[PDB]
């Protein structure tokens, strides 16, 4: 019983902490995803040029 | 116990996963900072052009 508490507070901790990261890093993939959208717009405007 | 056995396997689980985007998430970092080593540049050189 003694176990039973510990873990339920240790299990609800990580099940924030990853939802925090997934929240963060849908940011970053999103985020890498729309500086491609800026990449792949330099090599057709700097080839114009 | 019976309940003490059964998380014993759910709190490896994640300890992989976590550890598997962790691996994964510092390639992305590092890739989205050197595509930023990448756009620094182009706006040197494009500037020059």
């Known amino acids: ?3 039973v508490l510990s873990l339920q507070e240790e ?3 990580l099940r ?3 939802h925090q990261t997934q ?3 849908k940011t970053i993939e999103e985020w890498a ?3 491609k959208h800026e990449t792949e717009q ?3 405007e ?3 040029q």
Do not use: F, G, H, P
């Open 42 to 44: 330099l090599v057709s």
């Open 23 to 25: 929240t963060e890093k």
């Open 11 to 13: 299990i609800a901790k």
């Open 33 to 35: 995803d729309k500086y």
């Open 46 to 48: 700097l080839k114009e």
């Open 1 to 3: 019983t003694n176990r």
């Open 16 to 18: 924030k902490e990853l």
